[PDB]
Every structure is written in structure tokens, then in C-alpha cells.
């Protein structure tokens, strides 16, 4: 029986196919088909119809934390998946981490007089003028960064004060250029169209290697993750657990991390990677690191999403 893996498409899904699906096929003889992009409405419809066509799905960590209590997912088999080697921040009864990352303050050095070093600096247009880039999509990261920039301590960050965050974002709104994907964030910084911004840490590495002089500040770097889940009612449960155990193994995680610039979710992976890459990982930057709360997002993602896109509009319009 063919196993179906659903992810986000593009280079991340390509890396997962090469590091995980191929290794799984070579190891077990079970063929893995690629599908997607990940669509929560489709996962919900499949499960409710008892017509599950996706066996392993790469989902956002806050969706995993919401979907599990809702009965949309299979409970994971922790006798097949060894959770002892996995980052416990991303493990639930229904999910394990797929990969993780930090949002960091990236900067094209030679295009500016000085680089912002903190979230407060990134929101300080008087001191650091010009366009700044942030993640377009409603998700953990930007709201937390706005609050921390406004003086909220990491220990008192949650529950998020939304009015305070949007008031802070409003102070710099006209100077925000949104990045919708990783390669666009790199183009924005490299071209100096938005010389600094809150970007995935890994994207700063290909900038450095391409010949663009860059700086990265890790002050209050914000972590979030994607997860692997199994939709409730999969016809390939045993193979789905084995696929997840392979995908989250030290070598498979080291391979996915090396290929994507994302950070591995297996605590033994860094030791297996190129030491030059291992040094650049978020685990070497835990000092002032802020871990985004997947449980808070699980409880508020649908309402934040609706408010977020209404707010993000370039111009004010009344919806009714």
C-alpha cells in the first residue's frame, strides 16, 4: 500500500521527499507519494468523511496543538516513534516536530548606516529608517516581536495583548514590506528593497554564502515549528508511524536541516551535521530566546487570523 505525505510544496517538501520519503522507500519497500499543499479544510473534510487520503501531514505547530484535542488526528505510537530523542517543545499525544526555526533580525550591512539589534530597534524608524520585512501570514512571530519591541518581558508575553501589539505594528505599518516565502525574504534583504527584517534564521546563511554582507541579531530570537501528524482514519496507520519515526531520526533530521536551513527536532542531529552549520543553529542561541506558545496559538489562531488580514489591508475599508 502506498503511503501519502502532504507538505507545503517547493524546496521544503522537495527536501523532505529526498531526506525522508526516499530513505523510507529504500528501507521498507513502501512507496511514498507526494501530495499537498497542506490544507486544513481538506484534512478536516477527509477525516469527517472517513476517506483519509493523506497519511502523514506536515502542519504548523499551532494547528497540531489545536487539531489533536478536536479529534482530527490519530494518537501517535511512542513505542515506534522514540520521543526521548525529540525536542519536547514540539511533542504532543498527536504530534511531533517536523522542523523548527527562529525568527531573527537579519540585515544587509552595506545598504544601511547601522543594523537593528533588538525587536525594539527593528520597530524604531527614527533610529533605523526605511523598509523592514516581516512574515505575511497569520502565525506565531510578528505579534510577539511587536510586543517585545514595545517592552513586554518574555516572561509576561502570554496571553498576547493584541490591542497593544497592533498599536505597535501601526507605528511602523507604512514601512512594512511583507515576505510570503523564504526566497522572497532573501530577495528583499539582498536587493535592499527591505534591508532588514524578522526572517527565518536559515535564510541568512544563503545570503552570507551568495556574497551579500549580512548581520544577524539573535537578541530575543523567537522559535516556532512545524509538526508531523497522522489524520484520524488513515488506512496506513502502522506505515505512518514508521515514516514519522524515520523522519524524526537523528540522520533524517540532520539531512532535512542541512538541505533547508531549518533546525532539527532530534537532539542528536547537530552532532551529525557539518560543524560550520551546527554552530549556526538556534540551540547555540538560547540565552534570550523566546519560545512561541503553541497552546496559546491553538486557542486563538482562528480569531487572530481574521483580525490580522482585516488589519493588514493597505487601505481602510468598512467590510459591511
Amino acid at each position: 500500500n502506498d503511503l501519502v505525505f502532504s507538505s507545503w510544496g517547493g524546496t521544503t517538501q522537495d527536501a523532505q521527499k529526498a531526506a525522508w520519503a526516499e530513505k523510507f522507500m529504500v528501507e521498507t519497500g513502501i512507496n511514498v507519494l507526494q501530495d499537498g499543499p497542506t490544507d486544513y479544510g481538506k484534512l478536516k473534510a477527509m477525516v469527517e468523511a472517513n476517506g483519509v487520503t493523506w497519511d502523514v501531514v506536515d502542519v504548523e505547530g499551532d494547528y497540531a496543538a489545536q487539531a489533536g484535542p478536536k479529534g482530527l488526528l490519530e494518537k501517535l505510537d511512542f513505542s515506534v516513534i522514540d520521543k526521548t530523542k525529540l525536542d519536547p517543545r514540539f511533542v504532543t499525544d498527536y504530534s511531533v516536530g517536523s522542523f523548527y526555526y527562529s525568527f531573527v533580525i537579519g540585515c544587509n550591512v552595506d545598504s544601511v548606516s547601522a543594523c537593528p539589534k533588538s525587536w525594539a530597534d527593528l520597530f524604531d524608524t527614527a533610529k533605523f529608517p526605511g523598509k523592514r520585512t516581516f512574515y505575511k501570514w497569520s502565525a506565531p512571530g510578528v505579534i510577539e516581536a511587536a510586543l517585545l519591541a514595545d517592552g513586554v518581558t518574555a516572561d509576561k508575553l502570554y496571553p498576547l495583548d493584541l490591542d497593544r501589539a497592533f498599536k505597535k505594528l501601526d507605528t511602523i505599518k507604512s514601512d512594512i514590506i511583507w515576505w510570503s516565502g523564504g526566497a522572497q525574504s532573501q530577495q528583499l534583504i539582498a536587493s535592499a528593497e527591505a534591508p532588514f527584517g524578522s526572517v527565518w534564521n536559515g535564510r541568512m546563511t544563503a545570503l552570507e554564502q551568495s556574497g551579500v554582507k549580512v548581520e544577524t541579531s539573535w537578541a530575543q530570537n523567537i522559535t516556532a515549528a512545524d509538526s508531523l501528524v497522522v489524520p484520524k482514519g488513515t488506512k496506513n496507520k502502522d506505515a505512518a508511524m514508521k515514516f514519522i519515526a524515520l523522519a524524526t531520526s537523528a540522520q533524517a533530521q540532520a539531512d532535512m536541516a542541512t538541505a533547508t536551513g531549518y533546525a532539527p527536532v532530534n537532539i542528536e542531529s547537530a552532532k551529525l551535521m557539518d560543524p560550520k552549520i551546527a554552530k549556526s543553529l538556534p540551540d547555540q542561541q538560547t540565552e534570550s530566546q523566546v519560545n512561541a506558545d503553541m497552546n496559546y496559538w491553538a486557542q486563538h489562531r482562528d480569531e487572530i487570523g481574521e483580525r490580522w488580514y482585516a488589519w493588514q489591508a493597505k487601505h481602510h475599508h468598512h467590510h459591511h
Side-chain angles (χ1 to χ4, degrees), residues 82-106:
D82 181 5
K83 74 185 172 181
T84 74
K85 303 167 72 229
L86 308 185
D87 194 320
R89 296 177 286 188
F90 320 121
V91 176
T92 78
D93 290 346
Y94 308 88
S95 61
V96 294
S98 174
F99 63 84
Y100 88 104
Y101 49 86
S102 276
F103 287 106
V104 296
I105 305 132

PDB file of all heavy atoms in Angstrom, residues 82-106:
ATOM      1  N   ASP A  82      10.438   7.192  18.856  1.00  0.00           N
ATOM      2  CA  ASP A  82      11.137   7.376  20.122  1.00  0.00           C
ATOM      3  C   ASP A  82      11.124   8.865  20.470  1.00  0.00           C
ATOM      4  O   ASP A  82      11.884   9.657  19.894  1.00  0.00           O
ATOM      5  CB  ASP A  82      12.571   6.797  20.067  1.00  0.00           C
ATOM      6  CG  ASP A  82      13.377   6.917  21.359  1.00  0.00           C
ATOM      7  OD1 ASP A  82      12.809   7.370  22.381  1.00  0.00           O
ATOM      8  OD2 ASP A  82      14.569   6.541  21.351  1.00  0.00           O
ATOM      9  N   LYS A  83      10.269   9.248  21.423  1.00  0.00           N
ATOM     10  CA  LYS A  83      10.150  10.659  21.797  1.00  0.00           C
ATOM     11  C   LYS A  83      11.284  11.137  22.690  1.00  0.00           C
ATOM     12  O   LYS A  83      11.452  12.342  22.837  1.00  0.00           O
ATOM     13  CB  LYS A  83       8.741  11.008  22.350  1.00  0.00           C
ATOM     14  CG  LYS A  83       8.446  10.513  23.757  1.00  0.00           C
ATOM     15  CD  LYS A  83       7.008  10.815  24.145  1.00  0.00           C
ATOM     16  CE  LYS A  83       6.654  10.168  25.451  1.00  0.00           C
ATOM     17  NZ  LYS A  83       5.248  10.432  25.842  1.00  0.00           N
ATOM     18  N   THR A  84      12.096  10.206  23.249  1.00  0.00           N
ATOM     19  CA  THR A  84      13.200  10.571  24.152  1.00  0.00           C
ATOM     20  C   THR A  84      14.309  11.390  23.483  1.00  0.00           C
ATOM     21  O   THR A  84      14.966  12.184  24.151  1.00  0.00           O
ATOM     22  CB  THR A  84      13.708   9.358  24.974  1.00  0.00           C
ATOM     23  OG1 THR A  84      14.474   8.495  24.135  1.00  0.00           O
ATOM     24  CG2 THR A  84      12.562   8.566  25.655  1.00  0.00           C
ATOM     25  N   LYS A  85      14.480  11.234  22.170  1.00  0.00           N
ATOM     26  CA  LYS A  85      15.492  11.957  21.380  1.00  0.00           C
ATOM     27  C   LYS A  85      14.915  13.233  20.734  1.00  0.00           C
ATOM     28  O   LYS A  85      15.670  14.020  20.156  1.00  0.00           O
ATOM     29  CB  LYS A  85      16.038  11.047  20.254  1.00  0.00           C
ATOM     30  CG  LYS A  85      16.647   9.699  20.715  1.00  0.00           C
ATOM     31  CD  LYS A  85      16.857   8.737  19.522  1.00  0.00           C
ATOM     32  CE  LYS A  85      17.998   9.154  18.602  1.00  0.00           C
ATOM     33  NZ  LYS A  85      17.615   9.148  17.159  1.00  0.00           N
ATOM     34  N   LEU A  86      13.593  13.426  20.827  1.00  0.00           N
ATOM     35  CA  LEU A  86      12.884  14.563  20.219  1.00  0.00           C
ATOM     36  C   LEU A  86      12.778  15.798  21.106  1.00  0.00           C
ATOM     37  O   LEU A  86      12.706  15.683  22.333  1.00  0.00           O
ATOM     38  CB  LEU A  86      11.501  14.118  19.692  1.00  0.00           C
ATOM     39  CG  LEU A  86      11.499  12.882  18.743  1.00  0.00           C
ATOM     40  CD1 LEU A  86      10.122  12.603  18.200  1.00  0.00           C
ATOM     41  CD2 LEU A  86      12.481  13.050  17.581  1.00  0.00           C
ATOM     42  N   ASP A  87      12.793  16.998  20.475  1.00  0.00           N
ATOM     43  CA  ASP A  87      12.665  18.269  21.178  1.00  0.00           C
ATOM     44  C   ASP A  87      11.289  18.229  21.881  1.00  0.00           C
ATOM     45  O   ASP A  87      10.278  18.070  21.199  1.00  0.00           O
ATOM     46  CB  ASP A  87      12.762  19.437  20.179  1.00  0.00           C
ATOM     47  CG  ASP A  87      12.973  20.786  20.832  1.00  0.00           C
ATOM     48  OD1 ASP A  87      12.348  21.042  21.891  1.00  0.00           O
ATOM     49  OD2 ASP A  87      13.763  21.580  20.291  1.00  0.00           O
ATOM     50  N   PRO A  88      11.225  18.233  23.237  1.00  0.00           N
ATOM     51  CA  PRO A  88       9.916  18.090  23.899  1.00  0.00           C
ATOM     52  C   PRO A  88       8.981  19.287  23.715  1.00  0.00           C
ATOM     53  O   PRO A  88       7.780  19.147  23.936  1.00  0.00           O
ATOM     54  CB  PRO A  88      10.279  17.835  25.368  1.00  0.00           C
ATOM     55  CG  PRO A  88      11.594  18.487  25.537  1.00  0.00           C
ATOM     56  CD  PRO A  88      12.317  18.397  24.221  1.00  0.00           C
ATOM     57  N   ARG A  89       9.514  20.432  23.238  1.00  0.00           N
ATOM     58  CA  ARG A  89       8.701  21.638  22.988  1.00  0.00           C
ATOM     59  C   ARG A  89       7.647  21.366  21.902  1.00  0.00           C
ATOM     60  O   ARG A  89       6.613  22.033  21.872  1.00  0.00           O
ATOM     61  CB  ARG A  89       9.594  22.819  22.528  1.00  0.00           C
ATOM     62  CG  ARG A  89      10.619  23.320  23.555  1.00  0.00           C
ATOM     63  CD  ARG A  89      11.511  24.428  23.004  1.00  0.00           C
ATOM     64  NE  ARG A  89      12.517  23.928  22.064  1.00  0.00           N
ATOM     65  CZ  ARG A  89      13.514  24.649  21.553  1.00  0.00           C
ATOM     66  NH1 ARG A  89      13.645  25.931  21.866  1.00  0.00           N
ATOM     67  NH2 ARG A  89      14.390  24.091  20.734  1.00  0.00           N
ATOM     68  N   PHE A  90       7.922  20.399  20.992  1.00  0.00           N
ATOM     69  CA  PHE A  90       7.051  20.162  19.844  1.00  0.00           C
ATOM     70  C   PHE A  90       6.346  18.830  19.862  1.00  0.00           C
ATOM     71  O   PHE A  90       5.721  18.426  18.883  1.00  0.00           O
ATOM     72  CB  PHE A  90       7.819  20.465  18.525  1.00  0.00           C
ATOM     73  CG  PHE A  90       8.714  21.685  18.617  1.00  0.00           C
ATOM     74  CD1 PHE A  90      10.082  21.584  18.382  1.00  0.00           C
ATOM     75  CD2 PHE A  90       8.194  22.928  18.972  1.00  0.00           C
ATOM     76  CE1 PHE A  90      10.913  22.702  18.507  1.00  0.00           C
ATOM     77  CE2 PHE A  90       9.030  24.037  19.119  1.00  0.00           C
ATOM     78  CZ  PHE A  90      10.379  23.920  18.862  1.00  0.00           C
ATOM     79  N   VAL A  91       6.358  18.178  21.015  1.00  0.00           N
ATOM     80  CA  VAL A  91       5.701  16.879  21.124  1.00  0.00           C
ATOM     81  C   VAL A  91       4.357  16.971  21.847  1.00  0.00           C
ATOM     82  O   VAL A  91       4.290  17.542  22.935  1.00  0.00           O
ATOM     83  CB  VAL A  91       6.633  15.832  21.806  1.00  0.00           C
ATOM     84  CG1 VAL A  91       5.911  14.499  22.005  1.00  0.00           C
ATOM     85  CG2 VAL A  91       7.918  15.625  20.997  1.00  0.00           C
ATOM     86  N   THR A  92       3.309  16.389  21.260  1.00  0.00           N
ATOM     87  CA  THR A  92       2.009  16.216  21.921  1.00  0.00           C
ATOM     88  C   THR A  92       1.607  14.744  21.753  1.00  0.00           C
ATOM     89  O   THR A  92       2.338  13.995  21.098  1.00  0.00           O
ATOM     90  CB  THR A  92       0.903  17.148  21.385  1.00  0.00           C
ATOM     91  OG1 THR A  92       0.417  16.644  20.150  1.00  0.00           O
ATOM     92  CG2 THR A  92       1.316  18.610  21.330  1.00  0.00           C
ATOM     93  N   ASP A  93       0.425  14.343  22.267  1.00  0.00           N
ATOM     94  CA  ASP A  93      -0.055  12.961  22.083  1.00  0.00           C
ATOM     95  C   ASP A  93      -0.369  12.690  20.627  1.00  0.00           C
ATOM     96  O   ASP A  93      -0.427  11.534  20.233  1.00  0.00           O
ATOM     97  CB  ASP A  93      -1.328  12.691  22.916  1.00  0.00           C
ATOM     98  CG  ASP A  93      -1.110  12.629  24.417  1.00  0.00           C
ATOM     99  OD1 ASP A  93       0.069  12.534  24.850  1.00  0.00           O
ATOM    100  OD2 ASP A  93      -2.111  12.681  25.158  1.00  0.00           O
ATOM    101  N   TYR A  94      -0.549  13.753  19.820  1.00  0.00           N
ATOM    102  CA  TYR A  94      -0.932  13.650  18.410  1.00  0.00           C
ATOM    103  C   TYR A  94       0.107  14.215  17.437  1.00  0.00           C
ATOM    104  O   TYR A  94      -0.174  14.282  16.241  1.00  0.00           O
ATOM    105  CB  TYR A  94      -2.257  14.405  18.177  1.00  0.00           C
ATOM    106  CG  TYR A  94      -3.366  14.001  19.120  1.00  0.00           C
ATOM    107  CD1 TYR A  94      -3.525  14.629  20.352  1.00  0.00           C
ATOM    108  CD2 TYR A  94      -4.250  12.976  18.790  1.00  0.00           C
ATOM    109  CE1 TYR A  94      -4.544  14.258  21.229  1.00  0.00           C
ATOM    110  CE2 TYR A  94      -5.271  12.595  19.659  1.00  0.00           C
ATOM    111  CZ  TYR A  94      -5.404  13.230  20.883  1.00  0.00           C
ATOM    112  OH  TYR A  94      -6.406  12.859  21.746  1.00  0.00           O
ATOM    113  N   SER A  95       1.263  14.639  17.925  1.00  0.00           N
ATOM    114  CA  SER A  95       2.224  15.283  17.022  1.00  0.00           C
ATOM    115  C   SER A  95       3.623  15.254  17.550  1.00  0.00           C
ATOM    116  O   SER A  95       3.857  15.138  18.761  1.00  0.00           O
ATOM    117  CB  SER A  95       1.795  16.739  16.780  1.00  0.00           C
ATOM    118  OG  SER A  95       1.784  17.459  18.003  1.00  0.00           O
ATOM    119  N   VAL A  96       4.584  15.385  16.629  1.00  0.00           N
ATOM    120  CA  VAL A  96       5.997  15.560  16.947  1.00  0.00           C
ATOM    121  C   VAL A  96       6.465  16.676  16.007  1.00  0.00           C
ATOM    122  O   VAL A  96       5.826  16.901  14.991  1.00  0.00           O
ATOM    123  CB  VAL A  96       6.863  14.268  16.774  1.00  0.00           C
ATOM    124  CG1 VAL A  96       6.456  13.184  17.793  1.00  0.00           C
ATOM    125  CG2 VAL A  96       6.795  13.735  15.341  1.00  0.00           C
ATOM    126  N   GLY A  97       7.577  17.313  16.331  1.00  0.00           N
ATOM    127  CA  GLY A  97       8.164  18.358  15.498  1.00  0.00           C
ATOM    128  C   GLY A  97       8.610  17.781  14.169  1.00  0.00           C
ATOM    129  O   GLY A  97       9.025  16.617  14.104  1.00  0.00           O
ATOM    130  N   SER A  98       8.453  18.561  13.098  1.00  0.00           N
ATOM    131  CA  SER A  98       8.878  18.203  11.743  1.00  0.00           C
ATOM    132  C   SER A  98      10.240  18.876  11.521  1.00  0.00           C
ATOM    133  O   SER A  98      11.164  18.286  10.964  1.00  0.00           O
ATOM    134  CB  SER A  98       7.853  18.710  10.721  1.00  0.00           C
ATOM    135  OG  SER A  98       8.292  18.499   9.384  1.00  0.00           O
ATOM    136  N   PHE A  99      10.318  20.159  11.928  1.00  0.00           N
ATOM    137  CA  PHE A  99      11.486  21.029  11.898  1.00  0.00           C
ATOM    138  C   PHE A  99      11.134  22.265  12.736  1.00  0.00           C
ATOM    139  O   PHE A  99       9.953  22.521  12.999  1.00  0.00           O
ATOM    140  CB  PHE A  99      11.809  21.454  10.436  1.00  0.00           C
ATOM    141  CG  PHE A  99      10.753  22.276   9.719  1.00  0.00           C
ATOM    142  CD1 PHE A  99      10.691  23.663   9.882  1.00  0.00           C
ATOM    143  CD2 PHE A  99       9.886  21.682   8.810  1.00  0.00           C
ATOM    144  CE1 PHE A  99       9.719  24.417   9.216  1.00  0.00           C
ATOM    145  CE2 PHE A  99       8.936  22.448   8.118  1.00  0.00           C
ATOM    146  CZ  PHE A  99       8.856  23.808   8.336  1.00  0.00           C
ATOM    147  N   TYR A 100      12.140  23.042  13.119  1.00  0.00           N
ATOM    148  CA  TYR A 100      11.889  24.295  13.804  1.00  0.00           C
ATOM    149  C   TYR A 100      12.785  25.390  13.284  1.00  0.00           C
ATOM    150  O   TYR A 100      13.644  25.162  12.421  1.00  0.00           O
ATOM    151  CB  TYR A 100      11.841  24.175  15.330  1.00  0.00           C
ATOM    152  CG  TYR A 100      13.148  24.308  16.069  1.00  0.00           C
ATOM    153  CD1 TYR A 100      13.463  25.473  16.762  1.00  0.00           C
ATOM    154  CD2 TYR A 100      14.022  23.225  16.181  1.00  0.00           C
ATOM    155  CE1 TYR A 100      14.649  25.587  17.487  1.00  0.00           C
ATOM    156  CE2 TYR A 100      15.213  23.329  16.898  1.00  0.00           C
ATOM    157  CZ  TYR A 100      15.518  24.510  17.556  1.00  0.00           C
ATOM    158  OH  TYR A 100      16.670  24.611  18.292  1.00  0.00           O
ATOM    159  N   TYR A 101      12.554  26.607  13.758  1.00  0.00           N
ATOM    160  CA  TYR A 101      13.340  27.722  13.275  1.00  0.00           C
ATOM    161  C   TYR A 101      13.220  28.821  14.307  1.00  0.00           C
ATOM    162  O   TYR A 101      12.402  28.720  15.230  1.00  0.00           O
ATOM    163  CB  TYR A 101      12.752  28.199  11.921  1.00  0.00           C
ATOM    164  CG  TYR A 101      11.246  28.394  11.956  1.00  0.00           C
ATOM    165  CD1 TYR A 101      10.687  29.598  12.386  1.00  0.00           C
ATOM    166  CD2 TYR A 101      10.381  27.368  11.589  1.00  0.00           C
ATOM    167  CE1 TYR A 101       9.306  29.765  12.478  1.00  0.00           C
ATOM    168  CE2 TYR A 101       8.997  27.523  11.677  1.00  0.00           C
ATOM    169  CZ  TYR A 101       8.466  28.731  12.106  1.00  0.00           C
ATOM    170  OH  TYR A 101       7.105  28.898  12.168  1.00  0.00           O
ATOM    171  N   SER A 102      14.029  29.859  14.133  1.00  0.00           N
ATOM    172  CA  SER A 102      13.946  31.071  14.912  1.00  0.00           C
ATOM    173  C   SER A 102      13.678  32.217  13.972  1.00  0.00           C
ATOM    174  O   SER A 102      14.288  32.272  12.904  1.00  0.00           O
ATOM    175  CB  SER A 102      15.275  31.358  15.613  1.00  0.00           C
ATOM    176  OG  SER A 102      15.386  30.645  16.830  1.00  0.00           O
ATOM    177  N   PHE A 103      12.862  33.194  14.408  1.00  0.00           N
ATOM    178  CA  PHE A 103      12.769  34.461  13.677  1.00  0.00           C
ATOM    179  C   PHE A 103      13.873  35.297  14.290  1.00  0.00           C
ATOM    180  O   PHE A 103      13.976  35.382  15.521  1.00  0.00           O
ATOM    181  CB  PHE A 103      11.438  35.162  13.887  1.00  0.00           C
ATOM    182  CG  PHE A 103      10.323  34.466  13.160  1.00  0.00           C
ATOM    183  CD1 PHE A 103       9.387  33.705  13.861  1.00  0.00           C
ATOM    184  CD2 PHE A 103      10.211  34.556  11.774  1.00  0.00           C
ATOM    185  CE1 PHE A 103       8.333  33.084  13.193  1.00  0.00           C
ATOM    186  CE2 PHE A 103       9.172  33.911  11.099  1.00  0.00           C
ATOM    187  CZ  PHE A 103       8.229  33.196  11.817  1.00  0.00           C
ATOM    188  N   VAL A 104      14.744  35.823  13.446  1.00  0.00           N
ATOM    189  CA  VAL A 104      15.903  36.629  13.866  1.00  0.00           C
ATOM    190  C   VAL A 104      15.871  37.966  13.136  1.00  0.00           C
ATOM    191  O   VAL A 104      15.122  38.122  12.157  1.00  0.00           O
ATOM    192  CB  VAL A 104      17.253  35.893  13.581  1.00  0.00           C
ATOM    193  CG1 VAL A 104      17.366  34.614  14.411  1.00  0.00           C
ATOM    194  CG2 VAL A 104      17.418  35.582  12.085  1.00  0.00           C
ATOM    195  N   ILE A 105      16.712  38.904  13.573  1.00  0.00           N
ATOM    196  CA  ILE A 105      16.782  40.220  12.944  1.00  0.00           C
ATOM    197  C   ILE A 105      17.953  40.210  11.938  1.00  0.00           C
ATOM    198  O   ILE A 105      19.122  40.286  12.328  1.00  0.00           O
ATOM    199  CB  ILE A 105      16.873  41.357  13.987  1.00  0.00           C
ATOM    200  CG1 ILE A 105      15.700  41.282  14.991  1.00  0.00           C
ATOM    201  CG2 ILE A 105      16.878  42.705  13.271  1.00  0.00           C
ATOM    202  CD1 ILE A 105      16.104  41.388  16.397  1.00  0.00           C
ATOM    203  N   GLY A 106      17.605  40.046  10.676  1.00  0.00           N
ATOM    204  CA  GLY A 106      18.555  39.970   9.567  1.00  0.00           C
ATOM    205  C   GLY A 106      18.762  41.331   8.959  1.00  0.00           C
ATOM    206  O   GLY A 106      17.835  42.136   8.971  1.00  0.00           O
TER     207      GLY A 106
END
